[PDB]
Amino acid sequence: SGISLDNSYKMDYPEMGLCIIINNKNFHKSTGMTSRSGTDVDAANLRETFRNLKYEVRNKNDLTREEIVELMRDVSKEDHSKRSSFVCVLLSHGEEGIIFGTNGPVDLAKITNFFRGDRCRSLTGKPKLFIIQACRGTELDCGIEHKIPVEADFLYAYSTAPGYYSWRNSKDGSWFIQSLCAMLKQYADKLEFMHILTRVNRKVATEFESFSFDATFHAKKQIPCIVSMLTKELYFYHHH
């Protein structure tokens, strides 16, 4: 055949792959964590968005830290041979490097490690996308007017910069997930995924600002944070 290029991930396996959505809304009283109003709006938006991208979506609600780890361990031990990619969306409270189960924290690295190139062989060489709506600290943005690496082929789409709070609207859903679904809906059949996420960055950065009766939390801004260890371009569509 003619000249070939391989700059983009193969996304025409029989299945796009799993989209695991962990939606933690209600937390055990003893943790002292507030209920995350608006997160069901996020979970429903994501389910529909990834459904239309032909992901096999699994929604899970209010999982303990133990249930989160067991779920991700079990998913990582499935046969993904016929799947193009893997997507996991985490909706919860968080801190830098951490997301909360309903009863306590989970290290993000513990979750993602299950899918390392050497630990989930049927996903080796395939894009593994972790989408994280959770705080990464308490900073507020005031704004201004042979082998491959085991850590290769991961993408972490963080809702916010390192060290910063992340914003969720109780009526509309989180700024980041709102924006992400909107840009996927509009551009998944047109743009490469980094360029989609870049539009998400701009949407969140320009179109949202917090409103609070509390001066400390009022008029604040947010920028999401794309972390890519991908080795190829990612298009959700394929040719034929």
């Binding site: 507030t34 995350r36 109003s37 608006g38 919860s92 409270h93 968080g94 709506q133 959770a134 705080c135 809702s159 709070y165 992340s166 914003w167 969720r168 609207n169 109780s170 989180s174 917090s210 409103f211 609070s212 939390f217």
Partner: peptide, 4 residues
Amino acid sequence: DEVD
């Protein structure tokens, strides 16, 4: 608006 609330923080996570």
